Ligand binder design. Sequence first.
Ligand SMILES: [Ca+2]
Ligand SMILES: [Ca+2]
Ligand SMILES: [Ca+2]
Ligand SMILES: [Ca+2]
Ligand SMILES: [Ca+2]
Ligand SMILES: [Ca+2]
Ligand SMILES: [Ca+2]
Ligand SMILES: [Ca+2]
Ligand SMILES: [Ca+2]
Lengths: 48, 145, 729, 195
Amino acid sequence: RIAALERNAFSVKPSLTIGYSVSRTSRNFDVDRLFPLNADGTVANNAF
Amino acid sequence: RIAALERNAFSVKPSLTIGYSVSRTSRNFDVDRLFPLNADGTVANNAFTSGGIDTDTGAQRRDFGDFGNASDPVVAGAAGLYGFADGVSYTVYFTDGSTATFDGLNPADYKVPTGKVIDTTKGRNGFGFNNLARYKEGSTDIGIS
Amino acid sequence: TNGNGKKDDGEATGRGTYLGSGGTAAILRDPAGNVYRPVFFRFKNATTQFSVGNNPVIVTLGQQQKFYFSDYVFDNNYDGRGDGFTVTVDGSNVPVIGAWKPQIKGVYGSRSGLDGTAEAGYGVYYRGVRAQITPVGTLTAGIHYAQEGRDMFGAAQNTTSTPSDVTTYGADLHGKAFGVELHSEYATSRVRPNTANAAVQTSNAFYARVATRKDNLAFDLNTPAAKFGNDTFGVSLYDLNYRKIDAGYNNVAGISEYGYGSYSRTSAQNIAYNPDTGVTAPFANLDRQAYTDANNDGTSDRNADGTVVATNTKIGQMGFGVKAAANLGPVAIGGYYDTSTGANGDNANRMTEAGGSAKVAYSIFSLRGTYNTLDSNRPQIYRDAAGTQIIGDAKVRRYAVQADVTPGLGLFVGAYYRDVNVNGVRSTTDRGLLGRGYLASSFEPGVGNNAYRTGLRCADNNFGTGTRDIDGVGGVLNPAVNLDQSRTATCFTSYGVEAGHAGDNANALVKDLFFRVGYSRVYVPTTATATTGDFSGSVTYGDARYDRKVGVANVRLAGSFSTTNTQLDSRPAGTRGAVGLIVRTDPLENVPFRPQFNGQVGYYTADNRVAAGNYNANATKYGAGVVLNDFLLPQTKIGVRYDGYMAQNRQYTPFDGDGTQGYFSDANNNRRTNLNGVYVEGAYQDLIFSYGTYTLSQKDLNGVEYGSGINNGQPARGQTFKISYKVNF
Amino acid sequence: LGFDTSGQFSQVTSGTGGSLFSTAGRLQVNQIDLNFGLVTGLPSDAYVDTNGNGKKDDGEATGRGTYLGSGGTAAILRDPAGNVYRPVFFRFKNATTQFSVGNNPVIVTLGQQQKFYFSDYVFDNNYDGRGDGFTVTVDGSNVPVIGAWKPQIKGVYGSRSGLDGTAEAGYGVYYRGVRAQITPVGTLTAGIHYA
Ligand SMILES: [Ca+2]
Ligand SMILES: [Ca+2]
Ligand SMILES: [Ca+2]
Ligand SMILES: [Ca+2]
Ligand SMILES: [Ca+2]
Ligand SMILES: [Ca+2]
Ligand SMILES: [Ca+2]
Ligand SMILES: [Ca+2]
Ligand SMILES: [Ca+2]
């Protein structure tokens, strides 16, 4: 009986996000060209 | 505890359809009048019946065409091959951008309603023949509900 | 949007407001293949009543209350009236009066609940109460009071024809006591019109019967109400009634849903019982008809088809009737009488019918006599001698003598002699005038069954006058239609003889064989409107039917014949015949594969001697089909089907929107039809392939094809290929 | 928030059908790929496809612009006392279009964009497909006399691109073909075909 109930069941998965951010710039330019390059050829991760 | 859970449960019943169909016809006519009649008075089933049975209005499966994607009702008189096929009709081109449908065989028998005049330029003296061919292009349909 | 519960013109469709909820247009989707559809909550409540409490007192609160006080008073059990409540008090359990089963009902409500200012039920409320006891036997007596009127808001903004108030009360007595069934009812009404300072209109109804009633609430008139003696020496009474219905009594005066007019003006003209609208009143409010002249050209108006246009005025009804019988061993006799007029008693609306019968039946023989009479001074709609519909007086006199013999087995033979004399002159047909009454009765052939059943036996040993069919060859290929049991219901002036057979009887010479053959001579006057004449007409007809199972094949064949020199009903003169045959076989397990065959064939010819010009009509229909239940692959089967139809001077009239089905009929259109095709179907496992090609051609004489409709000389054509596959989760 | 069901709904079985005759049901089981579940909002990438081409042409309304309150920052469907309402949608995506019935020798496939390949220069359409139709394959590996040659016959029918407008190249265009094949000696495979 439990197996049949689980077959017709919905898995509720709520989500929640939280975070603060502020950013100012006189002109918009790129800074990903300053970060180190990994062995696979991708730049290092950063928050900006 | 299980009985309470089943009381507040939803039975999910998905559905799926699949099938291919192509149909061509020069003129739409009925073929349900050719099939054998069962002992209870109903014609034998077939895969080409676009028949709407309606006991309220007296409609039957032999009163509608079956060869296009449309269920064109048969028409009595010489216009519809004496009840054997869909009837001929014309469209009437009036002045000031209005049109009307004439459901006969001869366009020389149409009465012009008062307050309107036909535009001779469009069509054959304002009468445009309505084509009778019906086409259902070959395609397979998958329906999910 | 308007709340009426119907889809008016202009209201938006469901899929047009919620895009992506269905259809092919406006699919709400997402790149990477996602498709979104809104989720809806669907519900439907079929319950509107809520009964609280237990015996004795039960109270019901509902939304469209159905209730029924009596036949002529406050009967609203078909669709209901409106929003309110109903209380029922049952006093079966009580010390002193528990044996009489008292019962009290109470009703309150508002017509239709919320209504617009222009609707009849705006600010209109009803109320009522009914008492009841059952003193002796089934005999139930009761009294009731009813009321319906406008409130202070309804009386000022209703802008309709609803009366200011209606007050109705009465009594009834229904049941069976001391072996006698008795029904009666009295009712009085007072209607005050909506107009200013108008007089109160009083109208009352009354009737009193001695007859049996069914649970359907319709009177039987075939089972005696009061008997005496036994089957040897017995006298039974079937009906004895008196009625008086006022001219101003209708649904409004009775606070009912549907009025008390005649159900039909041609059959049972005095009876108001309407199964369609749920009216159970036994007697009607009669109509007097007259010619109509709207444009005032000096000539009475007629419809497009030649039918007269009549104007109806409401007269009451007041008369009496009787119907009895007497069994004296082998000899049985009967009789009836019935008269009616307007409520005022004037003789200018009198309709009187009377008649009798007789019967003697010893061993297999039989003999019957009959007499009938109609003296309708009341104007009635019927066709004249020439054939033009008229309105006026009518007098009919009919007498018939019928002999019978049943020499055993399924055999039967019967001769008859009938005579109809309308308006003082011999006539071919009675023009339906004898059907206006409701008490006409006749016996039935046989020994031991001396019941005096209602209805003239004008449809016994007659021929058939059918003209319409659905199979296309006259009904010989239709298993659901028995060609030998088709008999016309009109009363002719003829004498003939008929012999037949019935294979459904327990004793029969040949099982499952039905056939008949007859010969009658109809009376035709010298001219259309002459007085003298002779039996110039002549009819010879024969039918057959035989169902059998030989081996694995179920064989059925039928036939028919006819030849006349006069037109009868809607069937023209000239000969006519049709034959058919249907064969079906079970699968043959003894041969390779498992084939089961099918087949049918039909032929129909008719030489019509119509006045406009003699023409000939033909028909031919055939079929064949083989199904191989086990093909080469283990789970594969295939089937084929061939059909055809060749007609000549025949047509098909499509269905009428009123409720009448279509049919095939003869027509002098001078056109030959040829419709045929093939139908191939094969299945692998559960995958079905369907193919079919057909061709219809209709060319007139001298060979001018009309099939395509564009006058190119080509016939119509059609083709379809379909692959089907049904899956379940 | 999102509702996700289990994966038990990934298999279907056949049913009875036919007009001249009735077949036995539950003769085949077909594996399908359905991923469906309830969602409480629409992504910014959604749109309303009115012409049926499967692409977001210019002018077609966005998904969030037709169902207000289904996402984004503008047009929040709320209620004082803090309640916020979002419509509930049913999301699904089928990655299966073919349905193979039967077992060896004869296998029949019904699909929506049929991929097939006869030879290099003839009737090679195994990249994107042609249209709506069916394909039948007969394999004669097990047969008394010619079982060692591994015969095989293919059959193809279809309508190019299925439903098309009057201006598209696939309007009223149908194809058909058949191919035979044997492997007499070694790997050497000979065959003939028609298109
Ligand atoms: Ca049809
Ligand atoms: Ca409405
Ligand atoms: Ca009301
Ligand atoms: Ca209402
Ligand atoms: Ca009723
Ligand atoms: Ca006139
Ligand atoms: Ca698009
Ligand atoms: Ca396409
Ligand atoms: Ca195409």
